[PDB]
């Protein structure tokens, strides 16, 4: 079990002003550090928002929060789950801000609710280091889907932060998991059920979102949006990022307006449909550390079956142990770079049943 702490300093806030906060299980062995994002979309105005407080409470507020969570794939303290960092210092970080962790705005007379995503992963980072962060070699800040995509926007910042505290020994990494997203042509035209380009445009304002400097310096002022998908914001980052991304990703099908009942699937869809695979394919052609099956699934690393699914006859954590053995200073049989070529979901027999 992760145990919870809320945050000391209780102006860095949930969307409602109650305290964010992080769940920790301390390794006194280890000097590994995982940090986690938890994803769960986002909402980007008053009408939106109003709604996600009513039936998404504990991704906007600390005061339901269980006392302790249980931590599953790799945030799991056992080898047999966990391949890879069992034996970490483990953080699961709750996701309640809903900016995609992008915001710097509190609660005030002319904001109903605070978007503090980019503050909460800088105050959980300072709190942690009087916990034993202060003695990490190594800190992987992971997340899936919002939460992937908070690690891209994020990773840099905590490099930074740490750079300026005086820890410039700590290694700053990221695993980004079903946050790398394409700005493409939805199969069919849709309020706010809104393509992302247009939501997180409207968010960016909305929250005070900030996005990582070298990224904003290349798309400026109103065009910061640019900066939540992936292929376009990964090149300006320093620290090294592991991306984790399905072919077909559920949320990714969801905003692009498809739907797979059962029916025969026709000609103008299986073009659609393989054309993202191809495209997906595409944008991690130059990412040297990725896993990306073809499958039609959402999320990953925090799943307790994470260890079942293969690229070319490698797991998930066998790729993250090879990515650990390449930042030493290719290897033999322990690659790194493992994106599917088949152009179908479940091409891949090891795809999430
Ligand atoms: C508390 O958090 C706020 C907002 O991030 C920050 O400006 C302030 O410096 C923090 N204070 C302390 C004592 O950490
Ligand atoms: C750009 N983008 C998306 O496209 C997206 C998302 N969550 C789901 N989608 C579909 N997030 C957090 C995101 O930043």
């Known amino acids: 079990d992760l145990r919870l702490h809320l945050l000391l300093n209780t102006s860095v806030t949930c ?15 280890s000097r590994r550090w995982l940090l986690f994002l938890e994803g769960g979309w986002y909402c980007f105005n008053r009408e939106n928002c109003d709604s996600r407080y009513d039936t998404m409470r504990r991704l906007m507020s600390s005061r339901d929060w269980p006392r302790t969570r249980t931590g599953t794939g790799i945030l799991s303290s056992q ?13 699961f970080i709750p996701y309640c801000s809903s900016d995609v962790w992008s915001g710097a705005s509190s609660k005030s007379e002319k904001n109903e609710y605070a978007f503090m995503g980019a503050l909460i992963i800088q105050e959980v980072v300072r709190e942690l ?23 891209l926007l994020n990773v840099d910042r905590v490099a930074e932060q740490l750079e300026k505290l005086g820890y410039p020994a700590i290694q700053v990494r990221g695993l980004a998991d079903s946050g790398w997203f394409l700005d493409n042509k939805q199969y069919r035209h849709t309020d706010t059920i809104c393509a992302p380009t247009e939501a997180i445009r409207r968010g960016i304002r ?28 990964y090149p300006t980052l320093r620290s090294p990022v592991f991306v984790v991304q399905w072919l077909f990703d559920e949320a990714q099908l969801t905003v692009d307006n498809v ?19 191809r495209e997906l394919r595409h944008t991690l052609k130059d990412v040297p550390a990725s896993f990306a099956p073809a499958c039609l699934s959402h999320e990953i690393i925090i799943r307790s079956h994470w260890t079942d699914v293969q690229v070319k006859g490698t797991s ?20 790194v770079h493992l994106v599917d070529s088949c152009p179908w979901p479940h091409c891949n027999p090891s795809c999430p049943t």
Not at 21 to 26: A, D, F, I, S, V
Not at 135 to 142: N, P, Y
Not at 206 to 230: A, K, L
């Open 15 to 29: 969307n409602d002003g109650s305290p964010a906060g992080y769940y920790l299980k301390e390794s006194r062995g």
């Open 79 to 91: 080898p047999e789950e966990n391949p890879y960092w069992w034996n970490a210092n483990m953080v």
């Open 129 to 151: 280091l009087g916990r034993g962060l202060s003695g990490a070699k190594v800190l992987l800040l992971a997340g899936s889907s919002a939460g992937g995509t908070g690690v």
């Open 206 to 233: 909305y929250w005070n979102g900030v996005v990582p400097e070298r990224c904003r310096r290349q798309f400026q002022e109103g065009e910061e949006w640019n900066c939540f998908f992936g292929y376009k914001v």
């Open 259 to 277: 739907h797979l009942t059962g029916q025969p699937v026709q000609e103008g869809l299986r073009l659609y449909i393989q054309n993202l695979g």
């Open 316 to 335: 998930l954590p066998r790729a993250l142990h090879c990515w650990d053995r390449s930042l030493h200073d290719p290897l033999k049989g322990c690659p």
